[PDB]
Amino acid sequence: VYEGLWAADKKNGTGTYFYMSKGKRFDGVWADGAIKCGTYSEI
Amino acid sequence: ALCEALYEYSGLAVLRLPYNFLNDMAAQAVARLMQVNPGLQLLDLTGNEVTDKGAAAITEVLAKPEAGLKALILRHNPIGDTGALAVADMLRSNRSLTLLDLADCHVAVKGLIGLANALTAPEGNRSLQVLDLEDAQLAAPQDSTYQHMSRMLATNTTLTELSLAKCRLVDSQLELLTTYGFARSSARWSSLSLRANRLSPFSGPTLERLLALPALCRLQRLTLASNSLGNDGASALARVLPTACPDIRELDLRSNGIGDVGLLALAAALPLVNSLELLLLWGNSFSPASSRAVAEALAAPALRRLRSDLRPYVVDGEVALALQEVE
Amino acid sequence: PEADTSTQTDAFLDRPPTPLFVPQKTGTDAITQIENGDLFDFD
Amino acid sequence: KAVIKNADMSEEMQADAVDCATQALEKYNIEKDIAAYIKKEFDRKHNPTWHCIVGRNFGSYVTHETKHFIYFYLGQVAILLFKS
Amino acid sequence: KAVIKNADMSEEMQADAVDCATQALEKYNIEKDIAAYIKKEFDRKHNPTWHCIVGRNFGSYVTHETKHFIYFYLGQVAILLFKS
Amino acid sequence: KAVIKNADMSEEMQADAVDCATQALEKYNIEKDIAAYIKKEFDRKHNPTWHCIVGRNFGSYVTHETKHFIYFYLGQVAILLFKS
Amino acid sequence: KAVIKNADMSEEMQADAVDCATQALEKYNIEKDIAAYIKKEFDRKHNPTWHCIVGRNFGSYVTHETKHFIYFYLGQVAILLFKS
Amino acid sequence: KAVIKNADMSEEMQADAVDCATQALEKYNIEKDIAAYIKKEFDRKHNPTWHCIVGRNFGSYVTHETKHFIYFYLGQVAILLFKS
Amino acid sequence: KAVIKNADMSEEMQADAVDCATQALEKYNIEKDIAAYIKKEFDRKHNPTWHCIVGRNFGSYVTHETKHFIYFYLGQVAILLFKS
């Protein structure tokens, strides 16, 4: 699941993405792409 | 000198020149002697200054289909890749040698590729039973020699024991060897000696797959020591040993980072193996609980003659603790 | 598709070094005494 | 928590790389050897060729091909991993 | 004076590489700048694909083109250069 | 059957050092000559930077690299083998 | 003759230890020098880390490398010999 | 009280040894008991091995690890204590 | 007291080495202490990588970059010291 700011992608909006199957989650900035920065944590 | 003036005719089951700093012309002399005297079975010229010229002389006098010799031991000799190619060539024609021991001899990828190729089943040797290679200096990430040795293992059906001691052996190379040679071989493997490799704890699953095989059915002398396994590797050995290898004569886990959890797991699994005789595990770690467990297990009634390098003693508070014990 | 990227590593917090080696206790424990009436004779 | 300082990578691939690095740290201490583990891991699982460099202080300039570049901080080290 | 700890390239290119690195030291001071300068000027000297890493503490396990690889020191700074 | 007193080193190359000392003792007793033999062995097997001391008793203070230093007793001689 | 009370040692080695201790207790004069000669001879013919104690009223709690320990009487003194 | 006849320890270790011995003596009297208490305390406090000799007349000749050797009297009863 | 038989140094540099050792033998006592202090002196005085070995008896075979290497007998203790 993806939860955040969206310009079909790549809006540098702080979002949160959930590897719910694995059990991890990544919160940060989808800066003009799928990835530039953020923090990856353990729910 | 003294060596070159030996002249004998009768008997000569074995010859043992332990080191004696043999020159290479002396090797020429011994090869000349053994050529003109076809009587001998074992030759031992460990630790000399024998170079490729004496290597060539011995190899070419052995390459004849007459004047058979059975055991050839040459350790600590700068024999190089030219010498390795010469010995592979001579083995391609010989039929009497059964033990080829080339350890500490400076072999590179080229020489040991040649050796591995010279024993593929069609053009190789049904004769050799013990191929001892060691100190194969593949320091660079050379990933082809192990493929050629895998082809050796898949085709040959006469070897019984080998060693990859002190050969740089990453888990990728070991997995390649295991799958592509042992999941396809068909022989009777007695000993495989892998002391002092570069083995990660990640080698648990691949080591388990290796030890649970039909080709490695009657595996006897396993000396998987001195690598950098850990608690995971020890657990893998614990959960694969009691069933797969039914008669494993000796087990040797020395200097692996065994720690204590792996020891605890292996303690409750040692009793179910009665074919163990020499169990060598010293130099890892010993917490009081693990030492208590090993004292509980090693003295299990079934395992009487199990020699080890552990003696469990007792101190105050019933803190049973194990120390080293020479054979 | 080929792009260029450059980076430079920033401050890592200090981490204590590898602790010191103590070899394994490689010996049996023992016990010893010389009691009264041992080793001696009045005459 | 990890810190993905810089990257060019899909999201599940991000997770795969960081999780493999986690396993490498849980079993390993040396630097080049963690690098070798991750490099062989993607050279096997994902697209054919890769390169990896782990370190605490280093500066780099590489021509990664798109969507297979990553540089993240995990544990006490920093991992640069990219396919060319 | 630069010391080549390992290499796979030819002698003339080794000399060019050491000269490149010394020039980079003379011009810049940040490892990222060193790497960028070295990489781009090799790129324009020889061929499009090259890679350079400059650091004081890193480990690397890389898979590179034949005959273009050098791991060499400059007093205290280690530079890894190779062809993709 | 050497005794290991201090170690900043792996295990496989510790085993190499131990049996290297055994072979060198079978070959010689002269301290300079055994030191030379061990030095050549570990300058060939591993890339040549190492060196060693083989003394009945002495004192030492060295700066080995992070992962190449062993100090073990074997036969009758304290052997201190390290990299630099 | 001599008396061997409490042993953890091979029989031939016990015989050699008795011969050594008897020659020392014969030639030398003082208990510490008895210890010194015993230790030096077992060092020069077997192994380096020996320990000798010639006493007449003492109780210890010692740790010894396995298969090397003897506690025996010769005349008016008690000799303890252990490897560590 | 405490006569530190011959030592090569440090001051903190010195006080630790002396007050541990003073503690032991008011507990027990047998040489076995005193040596056992003292050396178990010092093993559990410092390091793997500790050879403890408790007695009134005895020599010695023992190889010690530097800074871990002591020989002192508590009134009349003597204690040797050394790590090797 | 000071006398050198193997040294690959300049005159004033040898004088400095002899002076540092000649002060350190009275500053410190133990062989590792003498080695440590002389190493620190030639470390923070000339160059950041010097290695010293001090022995009453030892045999050693080392590799030194040229012109920075010394071995001398300062009376009752052998001392050796070299560059990286």
PDB file of N, CA, C and O in Angstrom, chain D residues 1 8 13 16 18 20 29 32 36-38 46 49 52 61 63 65-67 69 72 77 79-81 84:
ATOM      1  N   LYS D   1      16.219   1.725  12.827  1.00  0.00           N
ATOM      2  CA  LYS D   1      15.722   2.111  11.512  1.00  0.00           C
ATOM      3  C   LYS D   1      16.864   2.435  10.557  1.00  0.00           C
ATOM      4  O   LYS D   1      17.873   3.009  10.959  1.00  0.00           O
ATOM      5  N   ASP D   8      18.228   5.238  -6.591  1.00  0.00           N
ATOM      6  CA  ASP D   8      17.459   5.214  -7.830  1.00  0.00           C
ATOM      7  C   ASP D   8      17.086   3.745  -8.018  1.00  0.00           C
ATOM      8  O   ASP D   8      17.900   2.953  -8.508  1.00  0.00           O
ATOM      9  N   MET D  13      12.557  -3.610  -4.711  1.00  0.00           N
ATOM     10  CA  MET D  13      13.996  -3.797  -4.832  1.00  0.00           C
ATOM     11  C   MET D  13      14.737  -3.075  -3.711  1.00  0.00           C
ATOM     12  O   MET D  13      15.745  -3.580  -3.199  1.00  0.00           O
ATOM     13  N   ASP D  16      14.447  -5.372  -0.838  1.00  0.00           N
ATOM     14  CA  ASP D  16      15.315  -6.532  -0.993  1.00  0.00           C
ATOM     15  C   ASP D  16      16.753  -6.180  -0.642  1.00  0.00           C
ATOM     16  O   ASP D  16      17.421  -6.908   0.102  1.00  0.00           O
ATOM     17  N   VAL D  18      17.938  -3.653   1.212  1.00  0.00           N
ATOM     18  CA  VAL D  18      18.147  -3.340   2.622  1.00  0.00           C
ATOM     19  C   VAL D  18      18.043  -4.594   3.481  1.00  0.00           C
ATOM     20  O   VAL D  18      18.781  -4.742   4.462  1.00  0.00           O
ATOM     21  N   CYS D  20      18.774  -7.751   2.551  1.00  0.00           N
ATOM     22  CA  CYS D  20      19.995  -8.523   2.349  1.00  0.00           C
ATOM     23  C   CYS D  20      21.162  -7.900   3.102  1.00  0.00           C
ATOM     24  O   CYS D  20      21.985  -8.613   3.692  1.00  0.00           O
ATOM     25  N   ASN D  29      31.205  -8.964   9.860  1.00  0.00           N
ATOM     26  CA  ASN D  29      31.917  -7.823  10.423  1.00  0.00           C
ATOM     27  C   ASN D  29      32.816  -7.122   9.414  1.00  0.00           C
ATOM     28  O   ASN D  29      32.899  -5.893   9.428  1.00  0.00           O
ATOM     29  N   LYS D  32      34.642  -5.533   2.930  1.00  0.00           N
ATOM     30  CA  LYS D  32      34.622  -6.094   1.587  1.00  0.00           C
ATOM     31  C   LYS D  32      33.819  -7.378   1.532  1.00  0.00           C
ATOM     32  O   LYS D  32      33.280  -7.723   0.480  1.00  0.00           O
ATOM     33  N   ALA D  36      30.879  -8.317  -0.932  1.00  0.00           N
ATOM     34  CA  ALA D  36      30.857  -9.496  -1.787  1.00  0.00           C
ATOM     35  C   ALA D  36      29.567 -10.278  -1.618  1.00  0.00           C
ATOM     36  O   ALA D  36      29.015 -10.788  -2.600  1.00  0.00           O
ATOM     37  N   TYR D  37      29.072 -10.399  -0.387  1.00  0.00           N
ATOM     38  CA  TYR D  37      27.807 -11.096  -0.192  1.00  0.00           C
ATOM     39  C   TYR D  37      26.696 -10.423  -0.979  1.00  0.00           C
ATOM     40  O   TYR D  37      25.968 -11.081  -1.727  1.00  0.00           O
ATOM     41  N   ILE D  38      26.554  -9.107  -0.829  1.00  0.00           N
ATOM     42  CA  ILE D  38      25.453  -8.426  -1.508  1.00  0.00           C
ATOM     43  C   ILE D  38      25.632  -8.487  -3.022  1.00  0.00           C
ATOM     44  O   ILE D  38      24.658  -8.657  -3.776  1.00  0.00           O
ATOM     45  N   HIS D  46      18.849 -11.008  -8.993  1.00  0.00           N
ATOM     46  CA  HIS D  46      18.383  -9.974  -9.903  1.00  0.00           C
ATOM     47  C   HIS D  46      19.229 -10.006 -11.176  1.00  0.00           C
ATOM     48  O   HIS D  46      19.901 -10.998 -11.465  1.00  0.00           O
ATOM     49  N   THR D  49      24.733  -8.467 -13.951  1.00  0.00           N
ATOM     50  CA  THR D  49      25.963  -7.919 -13.393  1.00  0.00           C
ATOM     51  C   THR D  49      25.671  -6.776 -12.432  1.00  0.00           C
ATOM     52  O   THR D  49      24.710  -6.023 -12.601  1.00  0.00           O
ATOM     53  N   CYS D  52      29.410  -3.559  -5.907  1.00  0.00           N
ATOM     54  CA  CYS D  52      29.063  -3.086  -4.578  1.00  0.00           C
ATOM     55  C   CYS D  52      30.316  -2.665  -3.835  1.00  0.00           C
ATOM     56  O   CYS D  52      31.385  -3.257  -3.997  1.00  0.00           O
ATOM     57  N   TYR D  61      32.120   8.282  -7.740  1.00  0.00           N
ATOM     58  CA  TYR D  61      31.490   8.811  -8.946  1.00  0.00           C
ATOM     59  C   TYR D  61      31.344   7.644  -9.911  1.00  0.00           C
ATOM     60  O   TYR D  61      32.346   7.155 -10.438  1.00  0.00           O
ATOM     61  N   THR D  63      28.790   5.598 -13.095  1.00  0.00           N
ATOM     62  CA  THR D  63      27.737   5.689 -14.110  1.00  0.00           C
ATOM     63  C   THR D  63      26.799   4.490 -14.000  1.00  0.00           C
ATOM     64  O   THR D  63      26.823   3.564 -14.808  1.00  0.00           O
ATOM     65  N   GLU D  65      23.551   2.323 -14.397  1.00  0.00           N
ATOM     66  CA  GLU D  65      22.401   2.310 -15.284  1.00  0.00           C
ATOM     67  C   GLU D  65      21.140   2.491 -14.444  1.00  0.00           C
ATOM     68  O   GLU D  65      21.119   2.188 -13.249  1.00  0.00           O
ATOM     69  N   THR D  66      20.092   3.007 -15.077  1.00  0.00           N
ATOM     70  CA  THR D  66      18.969   3.568 -14.337  1.00  0.00           C
ATOM     71  C   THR D  66      18.271   2.517 -13.485  1.00  0.00           C
ATOM     72  O   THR D  66      18.224   1.334 -13.825  1.00  0.00           O
ATOM     73  N   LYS D  67      17.745   2.975 -12.349  1.00  0.00           N
ATOM     74  CA  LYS D  67      16.871   2.204 -11.468  1.00  0.00           C
ATOM     75  C   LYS D  67      17.577   1.023 -10.813  1.00  0.00           C
ATOM     76  O   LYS D  67      16.916   0.120 -10.292  1.00  0.00           O
ATOM     77  N   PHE D  69      20.581   1.710  -8.675  1.00  0.00           N
ATOM     78  CA  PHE D  69      21.579   2.454  -7.922  1.00  0.00           C
ATOM     79  C   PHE D  69      21.051   2.663  -6.516  1.00  0.00           C
ATOM     80  O   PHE D  69      19.868   2.950  -6.339  1.00  0.00           O
ATOM     81  N   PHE D  72      22.772   3.657   0.914  1.00  0.00           N
ATOM     82  CA  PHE D  72      22.017   3.807   2.148  1.00  0.00           C
ATOM     83  C   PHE D  72      22.872   3.481   3.358  1.00  0.00           C
ATOM     84  O   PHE D  72      23.832   2.709   3.286  1.00  0.00           O
ATOM     85  N   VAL D  77      27.795   1.187   8.886  1.00  0.00           N
ATOM     86  CA  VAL D  77      28.467   1.313   7.605  1.00  0.00           C
ATOM     87  C   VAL D  77      27.538   2.018   6.623  1.00  0.00           C
ATOM     88  O   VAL D  77      26.408   2.376   6.947  1.00  0.00           O
ATOM     89  N   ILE D  79      26.414   1.645   2.380  1.00  0.00           N
ATOM     90  CA  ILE D  79      26.436   0.682   1.288  1.00  0.00           C
ATOM     91  C   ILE D  79      26.127   1.407  -0.010  1.00  0.00           C
ATOM     92  O   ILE D  79      25.091   2.076  -0.116  1.00  0.00           O
ATOM     93  N   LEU D  80      27.022   1.271  -0.988  1.00  0.00           N
ATOM     94  CA  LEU D  80      26.798   1.712  -2.355  1.00  0.00           C
ATOM     95  C   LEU D  80      26.702   0.478  -3.232  1.00  0.00           C
ATOM     96  O   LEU D  80      27.592  -0.375  -3.208  1.00  0.00           O
ATOM     97  N   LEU D  81      25.617   0.371  -3.986  1.00  0.00           N
ATOM     98  CA  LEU D  81      25.324  -0.859  -4.711  1.00  0.00           C
ATOM     99  C   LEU D  81      24.651  -0.487  -6.018  1.00  0.00           C
ATOM    100  O   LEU D  81      23.639   0.221  -6.013  1.00  0.00           O
ATOM    101  N   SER D  84      25.921  -1.990 -13.561  1.00  0.00           N
ATOM    102  CA  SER D  84      26.432  -1.336 -14.757  1.00  0.00           C
ATOM    103  C   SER D  84      26.455  -2.283 -15.949  1.00  0.00           C
ATOM    104  O   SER D  84      27.191  -2.062 -16.908  1.00  0.00           O
TER     105      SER D  84
END
